[PDB]
Amino acid sequence: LPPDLPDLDPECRELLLDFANSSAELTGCLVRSARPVRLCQTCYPLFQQVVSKMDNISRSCARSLLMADRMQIVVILSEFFNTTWQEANCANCLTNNSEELSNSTVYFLNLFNHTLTCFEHNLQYSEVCKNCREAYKTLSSLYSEMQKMNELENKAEPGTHLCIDVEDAMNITRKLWSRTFNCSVPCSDTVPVIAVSVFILFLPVVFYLSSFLHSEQK
Amino acid sequence: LPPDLPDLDPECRELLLDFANSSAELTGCLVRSARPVRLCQTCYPLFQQVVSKMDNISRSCARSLLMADRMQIVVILSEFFNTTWQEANCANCLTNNSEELSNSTVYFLNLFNHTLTCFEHNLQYSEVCKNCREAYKTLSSLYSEMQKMNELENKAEPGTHLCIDVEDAMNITRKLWSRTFNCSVPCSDTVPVIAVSVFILFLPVVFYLSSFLHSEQK
Amino acid sequence: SLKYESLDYDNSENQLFLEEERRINHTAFRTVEIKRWVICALIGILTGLVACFIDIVVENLAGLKYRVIKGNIDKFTEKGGLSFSLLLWATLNAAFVLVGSVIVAFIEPVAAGSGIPQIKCFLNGVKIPHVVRLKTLVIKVSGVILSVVGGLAVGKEGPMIHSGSVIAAGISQGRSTSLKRDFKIFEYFRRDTEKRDFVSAGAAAGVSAAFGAPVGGVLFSLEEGASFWNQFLTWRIFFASMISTFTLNFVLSIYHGNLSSPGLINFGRFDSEKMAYTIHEIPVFIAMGVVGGVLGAVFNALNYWLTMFRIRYIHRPCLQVIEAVLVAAVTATVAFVLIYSSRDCQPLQGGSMSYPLQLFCADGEYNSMAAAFFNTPEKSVVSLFHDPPGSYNPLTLGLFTLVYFFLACWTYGLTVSAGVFIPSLLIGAAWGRLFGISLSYLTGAAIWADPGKYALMGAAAQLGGIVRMTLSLTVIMMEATSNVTYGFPIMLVLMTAKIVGDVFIEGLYDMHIQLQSVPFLHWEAPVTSHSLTAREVMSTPVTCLRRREKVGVIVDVLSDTASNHNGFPVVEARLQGLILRSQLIVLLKHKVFVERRLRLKDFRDAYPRFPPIQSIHVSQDERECTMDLSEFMNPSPYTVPQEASLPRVFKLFRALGLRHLVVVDNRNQVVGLVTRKDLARYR
Amino acid sequence: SLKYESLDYDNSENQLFLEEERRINHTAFRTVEIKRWVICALIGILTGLVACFIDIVVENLAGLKYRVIKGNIDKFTEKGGLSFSLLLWATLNAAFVLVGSVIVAFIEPVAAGSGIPQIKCFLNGVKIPHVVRLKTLVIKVSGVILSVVGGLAVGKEGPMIHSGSVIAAGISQGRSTSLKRDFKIFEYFRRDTEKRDFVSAGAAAGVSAAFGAPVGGVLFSLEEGASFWNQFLTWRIFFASMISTFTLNFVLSIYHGNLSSPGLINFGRFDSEKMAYTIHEIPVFIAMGVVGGVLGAVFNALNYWLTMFRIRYIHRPCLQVIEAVLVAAVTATVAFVLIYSSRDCQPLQGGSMSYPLQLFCADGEYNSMAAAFFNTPEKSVVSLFHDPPGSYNPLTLGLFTLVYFFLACWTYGLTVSAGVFIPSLLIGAAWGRLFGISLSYLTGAAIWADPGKYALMGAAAQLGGIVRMTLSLTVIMMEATSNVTYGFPIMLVLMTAKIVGDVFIEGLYDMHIQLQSVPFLHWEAPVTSHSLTAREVMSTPVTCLRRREKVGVIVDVLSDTASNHNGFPVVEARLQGLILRSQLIVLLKHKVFVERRLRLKDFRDAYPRFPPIQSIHVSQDERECTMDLSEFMNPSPYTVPQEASLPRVFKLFRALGLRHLVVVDNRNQVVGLVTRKDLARYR
Ligand SMILES: CCCCCCCCC(=O)OC[C@H](COP(=O)(O)O[C@@H]1[C@H](O)[C@H](OP(=O)(O)O)[C@@H](O)[C@H](O)[C@H]1O)OC(=O)CCCCCCCC
Ligand SMILES: CCCCCCCCC(=O)OC[C@H](COP(=O)(O)O[C@@H]1[C@H](O)[C@H](OP(=O)(O)O)[C@@H](O)[C@H](O)[C@H]1O)OC(=O)CCCCCCCC
Ligand SMILES: Nc1ncnc2c1ncn2[C@@H]1O[C@H](COP(=O)(O)OP(=O)(O)OP(=O)(O)O)[C@@H](O)[C@H]1O
Ligand SMILES: Nc1ncnc2c1ncn2[C@@H]1O[C@H](COP(=O)(O)OP(=O)(O)OP(=O)(O)O)[C@@H](O)[C@H]1O
Ligand SMILES: *[C@@H]1O[C@H](CO)[C@@H](O[C@@H]2O[C@H](CO)[C@@H](O)[C@H](O)[C@H]2NC(C)=O)[C@H](O)[C@H]1NC(C)=O
Ligand SMILES: *[C@@H]1O[C@H](CO)[C@@H](O[C@@H]2O[C@H](CO)[C@@H](O)[C@H](O)[C@H]2NC(C)=O)[C@H](O)[C@H]1NC(C)=O
Ligand SMILES: *[C@@H]1O[C@H](CO)[C@@H](O)[C@H](O)[C@H]1NC(C)=O
Ligand SMILES: *[C@@H]1O[C@H](CO)[C@@H](O)[C@H](O)[C@H]1NC(C)=O
Ligand SMILES: [Cl-]
Ligand SMILES: [Cl-]
Ligand SMILES: [Cl-]
Ligand SMILES: [Cl-]
Ligand SMILES: [Cl-]
Ligand SMILES: [Cl-]
Ligand SMILES: [Mg+2]
Ligand SMILES: [Mg+2]
């Protein structure tokens, strides 16, 4: 029979096997590296390898492997990987070279490590708050600065997300601060606000009553 | 620190690892078993195991693994698997018990094997056609019968697809028959069709001319 | 031309009408408005049910016919003898079309055509003899069913309009004249004004059911009426149209099982990035409209040359039946030949075609020509609008466009219920998609060159070119497309397509109205209108009835066989009012002479059919008595100065829906009368 | 009430007009229609550009204000002293509102309000003194900008209507009276009829730009005009509206960079399975409309009690400025207090709010009350329509609904440019979503109980209840929603909401029109209309001008300080025509006496402002000369019989847009005259 219809050509066999191996590794790593979220710094090499292998396929065996079925399992798998990558903004962590993480995200994660070091240090909750205030505030300031830097660099719309690992760390810290330890102590200014609002609300009543009485007097 | 925020609880670790292993196996099998298409009969056990493991998770560790991130890698992976399964109609191959394939699809694939046996037998193309006509016709009749049976059993809309493996085999056979060997020999009835059409097209002209001449005569 | 009477929309404010209104308003409760709203609701509901019935029957019958033909073709593909399939197709088409043409040509010739020109004339104020009869409704429904199932290049959308009108004209009266069964409701609305109002509501409901375009139907009715603005009537028409759409959708949904069927034809959803136009596309659209106009004109032109022939050789009913049968057979033969000679085989997505036909094509493939001819026109149009860029072969599409254009031109004038909206839309969509493919080839596969958008534009352009509507058509297309933006291109292509068309020939509906010698009043008087005045328009001398007239003179004037005038101005020679022939006949039949008292109910009971003059018997002695007319005439007839300009007179006549306009001198002297025929004899 | 004159829509077909038309048609080419189309295109383009300018300026200024306030609040959150933020908010609001109220109250008081009542009166035929002036346009644009940026519960959508009208009234004349600059084009259209036509086109364009609803604007203009159907005028209005929408969308798109902005407010896309209604939901919709009506009535009622107070105590301009400033300050204070007392913190999706405010909320969370008050009303409405089931807290939504209801009731009558559409829509959406949440709780989280659909229904119900429009409002909501199906519920809720409202109180626009003592003609005469006749309506004795009248008598009658009549019927005592005061003044100014020849261009040059009687100087000898009036009057005035029924007279007067109607006897005897004030003094 013709080589292509009944069974696979010898060369395309290797490409399919390699893509299968890479996809399996990437999927396992994603599942294992999602709690706490480590998708970026752990899975970036595997994702790069998967993309490289699919490009290798696309650049003779493209026809016999990609689009000769109602489905295209290769295509849908790669597109799912790409959707997960894009919907993470994980390129934020990586530089233009894709080789290693940017110093910004390393710095943030390392401040996160130092912060949790402070938290555990003083756990054994006034102690923890009093001593880790500065660490938490530096962490939050850096998160805001990176948010603004990403927004201006990508010229993206406001509220655009960052690396999921950074956001997950930010949220873990926020939950530890606001709730488990409840260190937040916003100031209260009830009396000035109440007085000012009451006076301003009184003003229109005085205006209308004065108009009424003055018109009555004529 | 609290067990859940910074790091994973000991129990959820096992669930995440098991799901990762199953997902990796399933993805590798899908990539390897897609050319020629073998997704159903090869991957059904792995898909069943993945579904079972995710149900195991969902039924304490659901909270800490599923929906405590902007993403839910577990959820999106399982939903991608389910989309691939549903968009295959692969339940057609499997019985209600999900254990093994139905006798219908086994019978079809086995007729496909017998058919390709006939094709290779007579390859060494009039020989192949003359001897495998009956095999190909039985295969096509069975495919049509299964199409109708699926349509009436599922009460689905016309043209609904079947197991991707069955369709891929059907198409491989169709390509071998119609093109590589070009065995199809539809009959020609040019003369009767032409004569009938010409006469029927003449009729209106006669009608109008007769009306004209008769009215002129008065 | 003189058998076409007029509609008495101008209600006469006589003493009896004033007394009736006073009594009605003195009942402590008014029910007329509630009854009007109820009637509109019933009109919409029944129109929707009729549309549902038509759709269901067409679906089932056409499905069976196509299944039989496809089975025969597949059975004979390899064994041979494909001619027998052609014979079977032609025979089935001929049988169905034979039944339809027999029921129409012999029993009710009025049911022929779409029925839209008839309703246009009705809302203009002209009564065609058998437009709103029950027999006409039954015949039209059966004929549209048979013609659609008969394989003709026709549509089942336009006729709905007519159908709705009939219903509105029927249930409003509260009785069945044809069946001679009377129910004791809705006696008040037994008059021409309410009848016309309800008919406008019904036509709007029919348009909405056909296209899912309530506002479009409202605008259609408003344009055809072209009257003084009425807020409550417009509200009622809107209500009826929307109830019609809701009823159609709900009933179809419940029939199918599980709110996605606003109308009979549904173009689909155009909300996509592919369907989007730039400013640079404004010129091309216009250019394409030009083509429409041109093509449309040619279409109409040819039909004219056809119609004359039919009027003057093929006028006997049996000849009409033979012509319809032969047209159906030739349509089937042409479709079969085009499918047979096709060589383009395409893979089948699965469910893309209800009945995929494989003929000299590799297994697992279908023939596109079959898709074009072996399918319903509506979903063919829908596919033409929604398909990927490379879903069509230019040669097959061009052949289909040409052949269907000629077939639809041939088929419009046949003595069968049919329509011309969908065929025109299909022709336009086909050549518009051809234009889009050409542009994509020329523009290097540019993103903005989407063939479906250009197909929609071509459909709109062709529809406008053939039937030249701009506003209501634009709104209908906007609602069906469900996108407001695409209106701006549409309005342009419809604007130019119309203009170019008017250079060469008039529209189809207008042309057929004139060929029937119907007096049709347009929106405005001609260019020379300002030059003319009412003195030449009015007819003299005028036959006037004295406020104190004898029975003998009235009988003599009424019985005059020279002419039959249904309105006479009263005179003292000072105008005092106007009385219609019908009122005089009713008065004579009741022997109301001066030498126990009448009510308007007696006038309404004689509606809508009044006895002739010859029927009334008056003795010699009675003829010597006098008739006191003062208390039965219109005391405030509409009048214009003898020197009033023609455009002013035409404007007043059209806006107020008048039948008789008295032209008077400076001393309230009757010097002339004006009717629609005086105004319509200009161009 | 007597300072409100009327619009001369009834063109006088005098000899000079006939000669002008003859010459124009004898030029071998007609350009009037082309010029009309060009004018409509410019009207649409300029209205779109004005809308774009307003949107851009509002966006930038409001963004800066909100950013400053948010930065101050965040800076003082933990350090303390949050009162200073309240002071800053109030001060900014007060400054902007102060500038707006100063420009409106002192320079141009006519610019106050939405301007929709003024245009309604204009299309009805009543001229309010300074409605279509350039100063009014500039003041209205600046005031709407300042009020929207001033933090008031107002909208920038209604005023666009007014703006469009001005443009149509300005560029049509071809000259600038205010700037005293004349360009030599469009002399033909210097008349009331063309002015009203163009103004209707401009109002339709404004509606389309505001809501992206061209057909809705066309219907609005048609309803307000309520005249004889005109096909070409309706085509032109449709053209102008669609050009306006296209211009707005295109300019906004190019400004933003990369066809998704049909109007200023855009409700969004409702094409979803969540947005779908069953038959069982028809009753609840109606019930909800009831509430609307009730609530609407209360709203209007309170405003009435407010307006009277303002008319009779707060009428000095400085008091108006103080009131506006205080209202702005109180609005800011109430918003700040509600935000401060809020305890519901919600996670932020990212970009859900342009300026998310965190105040006594955990890090990474926002305050919903800030979202309600610290955001634009338009996108607040959009969010209310499109949010998940559990996106709101019932208590916060109820508080916001109540407070905003009272604030919007307070703010409508202020001496600042503003609007009442968007606030009513927002109130309706809020309490409709509250109803939807209640239903979902009651129905066990049923799928059909989607709060967004009920929010849309409540918005429609409240809008109808406050401003009681049914047809054009229904079409506007359908186009904005971009779904035709949801019309059927809408039409119902608008139908009942209106009806219930009419039981208690009239609408806002109508109420304000009456409070100005403007003579407003409704669609139909009252219930007792049939009883009355033209004899009581007409005013006697009539001042008539002989066809051969002396200059002295004409001067004496014109100069009579007892009353100022601008129309006199001519008499021989047989009616021969009608001549307006303006024509007599022009004739006297030119010394046209019999004891070189005039053209209509001289009449048009005096437009629109004519000199008074006192200005003309006539010597004693000249007064002894006679004036040949025959060749300058309306030779064919509209006339009705002395006994014609009142509804007939009112119908003719409203449809034809007449100013003077002669009531004549049986011998063409002048016995009375009828003007709009005679008809409007009924209820
Ligand atoms: C799903 C199917 C629903 C379809 C509804 C079909 C019913 C509509 C219809 O097809 O017609 C009804 C007939 C009247 O038609 P009809 O045959 O008597 O025709 C005369 C005659 O033909 C004159 O002929 P003319 O032109 O010579 O004067 C013409 O003018 C004049 O208008 C006509 O009344 O029965 C009824 O009223 C029904 C009873 C109404 C009371 C109940 C109200 C609740 C609905
Ligand atoms: C993006 C901004 C675009 C906005 C366009 C604004 C222009 C529209 C406008 O705001 O107005 C234009 C003014 C006329 O306004 P105007 O101040 O002179 O007002 C008198 C007066 O106020 C009477 O007052 P009255 O009520 O006492 O009689 C009143 O009736 C009468 O209608 C009015 O003409 O200039 C023009 O025409 C422009 C030249 C047109 C020629 C070019 C055509 C191509 C476009
Ligand atoms: N009372 C009348 N006296 C003299 N001429 C008349 C009178 N009524 C009508 N005519 C003229 O006679 C011609 C035919 O009139 P016809 O008898 O068709 O009137 P009609 O049937 O009442 O018109 P319609 O039914 O279209 O309103 C018309 O051209 C008309 O101008
Ligand atoms: N020529 C006339 N002779 C006698 N009464 C008149 C005449 N014209 C108007 N009136 C009456 O005088 C009253 C005031 O009329 P007015 O001077 O406002 O007319 P007008 O200003 O021309 O009306 P409008 O401008 O609203 O058309 C009205 O009630 C009207 O009926
Ligand atoms: C992040 O930024 C710092 C700048 O402070 C980079 O620092 C240099 O790093 C390179 C190695 O890539 C050294 O050779 C240089 O000596 C460092 N200092 C200077 C002044 O260049 C740092 O490399 C950046 N991080 C990454 C990953 O590139
Ligand atoms: C497919 O259908 C055949 C019927 O012809 C089934 O045949 C029986 O199979 C069972 C085993 O499951 C045997 O024990 C029986 O002896 C067989 N014959 C009869 C008459 O029952 C066959 O099992 C079916 N295939 C599957 C996978 O169930
Ligand atoms: C792609 O596959 C071929 C086949 O062995 C191999 O030679 C080549 O190096 C591959 N490319 C990359 C980038 O790995
Ligand atoms: C789910 O996981 C638990 C954890 O070990 C295990 O005991 C249980 O058997 C699992 N369930 C299934 C169906 O494998
Ligand atoms: Cl027809
Ligand atoms: Cl049709
Ligand atoms: Cl039609
Ligand atoms: Cl206002
Ligand atoms: Cl507003
Ligand atoms: Cl408003
Ligand atoms: Mg007649
Ligand atoms: Mg006046």
PDB file of C-alpha atoms in Angstrom, chain C residues 55-102:
ATOM      1  CA  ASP C  55     -43.859  26.618   7.136  1.00  0.00           C
ATOM      2  CA  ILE C  56     -44.672  23.197   8.594  1.00  0.00           C
ATOM      3  CA  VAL C  57     -46.527  21.960   5.516  1.00  0.00           C
ATOM      4  CA  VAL C  58     -43.831  23.206   3.136  1.00  0.00           C
ATOM      5  CA  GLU C  59     -41.093  21.617   5.231  1.00  0.00           C
ATOM      6  CA  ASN C  60     -42.748  18.199   5.328  1.00  0.00           C
ATOM      7  CA  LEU C  61     -43.873  18.036   1.695  1.00  0.00           C
ATOM      8  CA  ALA C  62     -40.637  19.394   0.225  1.00  0.00           C
ATOM      9  CA  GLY C  63     -38.634  17.049   2.433  1.00  0.00           C
ATOM     10  CA  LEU C  64     -40.527  14.029   1.152  1.00  0.00           C
ATOM     11  CA  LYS C  65     -40.237  15.148  -2.477  1.00  0.00           C
ATOM     12  CA  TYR C  66     -36.494  15.737  -2.209  1.00  0.00           C
ATOM     13  CA  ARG C  67     -35.973  12.435  -0.390  1.00  0.00           C
ATOM     14  CA  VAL C  68     -37.815  10.523  -3.119  1.00  0.00           C
ATOM     15  CA  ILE C  69     -35.875  12.243  -5.900  1.00  0.00           C
ATOM     16  CA  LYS C  70     -32.530  11.733  -4.150  1.00  0.00           C
ATOM     17  CA  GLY C  71     -33.244   8.063  -3.505  1.00  0.00           C
ATOM     18  CA  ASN C  72     -34.144   7.521  -7.147  1.00  0.00           C
ATOM     19  CA  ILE C  73     -30.998   9.330  -8.312  1.00  0.00           C
ATOM     20  CA  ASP C  74     -28.716   7.349  -6.003  1.00  0.00           C
ATOM     21  CA  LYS C  75     -30.377   4.075  -6.999  1.00  0.00           C
ATOM     22  CA  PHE C  76     -29.826   4.762 -10.720  1.00  0.00           C
ATOM     23  CA  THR C  77     -26.347   6.318 -10.434  1.00  0.00           C
ATOM     24  CA  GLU C  78     -24.311   3.163 -11.074  1.00  0.00           C
ATOM     25  CA  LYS C  79     -26.966   0.880 -12.573  1.00  0.00           C
ATOM     26  CA  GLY C  80     -27.685   3.507 -15.234  1.00  0.00           C
ATOM     27  CA  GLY C  81     -30.903   4.967 -16.558  1.00  0.00           C
ATOM     28  CA  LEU C  82     -30.586   8.359 -14.872  1.00  0.00           C
ATOM     29  CA  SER C  83     -33.179   9.698 -17.331  1.00  0.00           C
ATOM     30  CA  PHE C  84     -35.986   8.122 -15.301  1.00  0.00           C
ATOM     31  CA  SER C  85     -34.965  10.314 -12.358  1.00  0.00           C
ATOM     32  CA  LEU C  86     -35.369  13.381 -14.575  1.00  0.00           C
ATOM     33  CA  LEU C  87     -38.799  12.139 -15.652  1.00  0.00           C
ATOM     34  CA  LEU C  88     -39.820  11.607 -12.020  1.00  0.00           C
ATOM     35  CA  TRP C  89     -38.627  15.059 -10.945  1.00  0.00           C
ATOM     36  CA  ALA C  90     -40.452  16.743 -13.819  1.00  0.00           C
ATOM     37  CA  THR C  91     -43.618  14.717 -13.214  1.00  0.00           C
ATOM     38  CA  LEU C  92     -43.802  15.552  -9.501  1.00  0.00           C
ATOM     39  CA  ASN C  93     -43.178  19.239 -10.184  1.00  0.00           C
ATOM     40  CA  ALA C  94     -45.809  19.221 -12.925  1.00  0.00           C
ATOM     41  CA  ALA C  95     -48.416  17.500 -10.748  1.00  0.00           C
ATOM     42  CA  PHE C  96     -48.067  19.922  -7.841  1.00  0.00           C
ATOM     43  CA  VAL C  97     -47.987  22.967 -10.115  1.00  0.00           C
ATOM     44  CA  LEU C  98     -50.974  21.592 -12.041  1.00  0.00           C
ATOM     45  CA  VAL C  99     -53.086  21.405  -8.897  1.00  0.00           C
ATOM     46  CA  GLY C 100     -52.017  24.903  -7.873  1.00  0.00           C
ATOM     47  CA  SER C 101     -52.655  26.478 -11.266  1.00  0.00           C
ATOM     48  CA  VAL C 102     -56.017  24.721 -11.582  1.00  0.00           C
TER      49      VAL C 102
END
